[PDB]
Amino acid sequence: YTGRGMLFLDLIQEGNLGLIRAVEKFDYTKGYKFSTYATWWIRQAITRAMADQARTIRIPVHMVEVINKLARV
DNA sequence: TGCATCCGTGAGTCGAGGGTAATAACCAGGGGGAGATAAACGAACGCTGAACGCTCC
């Protein structure tokens, strides 16, 4: 997700918040590796922050998901 | 102590002119302001004439 109005190092720090979230909600009772669980939370934190901090005029999160959806189609 | 290196600064004058890119995507819940219907008063009207006077027989 580099090169979209957010600095590359800034993306790492916001994703880093997602990682600390994931460890508090992870356990061995599920028969799966930590890597599969973590990547969901990493992607969530990065994409939400990108929605909330890239544009000069802030756009609400649900308008942002509308425009990128229509752009791709 | 001398020699080598790099970093910062400055480099004319007025004229002419405007727009830039890219990636899991959702229920689920739920709060919070922005637009839709009955109650408190007093002011137009309303007939209520009643109650006063203004001319007339």
**Which nucleotide is closest, CA of A68 to its C1'?**
B23
Q: What positions of strand B are covered by protein, i.e. any atom < 7 Å from a CB? A: 22-26
**Which nucleotide is closest, CA of A5 to its C1'?**
B21
Look up the protein residue whose alpha carbon has the minimum distance to the C1' of B25.
A65
Q: Resolution in angstroms for this experimental structure?
A: 3.4
Distances from the Cα of A59 to the Cα of A40, A48, A66, A70, angstroms: 23, 12, 11, 16
Q: How far is the CA of A34 from the C1' of B56 (A)?
A: 117
d(CA A29, CA A46): 27
CA neighbor of A17 nearest in space, from A52, A34, A41: A41
